[PDB]
C-alpha cells in the first residue's frame, strides 16, 4: 500500500469474484474472441498457487488434457473472466501446491473438507 497508488487503481477492483484458497477445484468462464465470435470457454482445474497484491493479484489453475498437464495463469481482476465457481474445497497444508506438477494419477488427488 502507498495510498497514492491506491485510489488510482481502486476503481478497477472487481467485487464479483468469490473467496477461494489454494487446493480447491475451480471453474473459470473465460470470454474468447476467436476470429470474431464471442464464446465462453470453461477451464476447470485445481488452484495451485495464488500470489498476492492489489490490482496485481493473480492465480494459476492446473488441469490434465489428453494426458498432458496444462497450467493457466490469470489476473484476479481481469475483465475477461465472466464468472468463477468453486466446485469443491480441498484439504491442503502448503500455500503453493507445486508438488502436483510431477504427480500424475491417484497420488495427485487432493482430499476434501
Amino acid at each position: 500500500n502507498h495510498k497514492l497508488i491506491e485510489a488510482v487503481t481502486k476503481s478497477q477492483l472487481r467485487t464479483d469474484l468469490p473467496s477461494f484458497r489454494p487446493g480447491d477445484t475451480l471453474r473459470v468462464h473465460v470470454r474468447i474472441i476467436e476470429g470474431t465470435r464471442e464464446r465462453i470457454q470453461v477451464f476447470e482445474g485445481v488452484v495451485i498457487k495464488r500470489r498476492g497484491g492489489g490490482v496485481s493479484e493473480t492465480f494459476t489453475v492446473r488441469k490434465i488434457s489428453s494426458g498432458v498437464g496444462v497450467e493457466r495463469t490469470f489476473p484476479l481482476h481481469t475483465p475477461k473472466i465472466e464468472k468463477i465457481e468453486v466446485k469443491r474445497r480441498g484439504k491442503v497444508r502448503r500455500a503453493k501446491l507445486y508438488y502436483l506438477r510431477s504427480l500424475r494419477g491417484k497420488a495427485a488427488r487432493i482430499q476434501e473438507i
Partner: protein
Amino acid sequence: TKGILGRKIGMTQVFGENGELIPVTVVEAKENVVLQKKTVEVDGYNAIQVGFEDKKAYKKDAKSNKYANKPAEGHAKKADAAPKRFIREFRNVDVDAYEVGQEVSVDTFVAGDVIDVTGVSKGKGFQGAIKRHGQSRGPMSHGSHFHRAPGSVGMASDASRVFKGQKMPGRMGGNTVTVQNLEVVQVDTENKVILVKGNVPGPKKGLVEIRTSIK
C-alpha cells in the same frame, strides 16, 4: 502540452478498455509554478522556469536544505510564490504563462498523449566490464585464469598506447536518460497524478521531467 515536473511513485498496472493489461508508472505533479519567464531581449534564449515542490520558509539558523536561504527566498518572492525545490527550465513552449506565479496543473496533459520523460538517476557503484558494458566472460573447461577480466586493451608496439574511449571499470549508472514516445494513460485531479504508459528513469521519490514529444 507544457512540460511538468513530478516525483516517481512506483509502477502498477491497469486494464485497458478492451481487456488489455497496461504497465503504468505513477507520477505525482503538485505545487508547479512559473517563477521566471526568460525572453530573447534579457537572455538570448526564450524559456520558462518552473519550480516543482514547496520548501519551508526562511529560518535564521538552518543546518539543512529544508529551509530556503535568503537568495532563493528572494527569487521566489519576485513571482509571488513560496520557496520551491527543483527549479527547472522548459524550452520549446509558447510563452503564455506568467513570470509571476501561475499554477502549472496536470490537467494540461489531457491534450497530448505521447510524451517524453527525462529522468536523472539510475544508481549503481563501481562496476566491472561484464556489468558496465555487457562484455563476455572467459571459459572454465580448460584451466582458464580469465573470467570477468576486461581483455586486451590495445595492439602491441605499433600502437604503443591505449585509445580514448576504451571500455574499463568505473562508476556505473547515475546518468541522465530520456525515454521517448511514452504515452499518458490517464490524468487525475484531486491527487495531481499522471499515469504514464511504461517505465521512467530513476528511483522512487526521484525527479522526472515530462514534456510533449519532440518527434
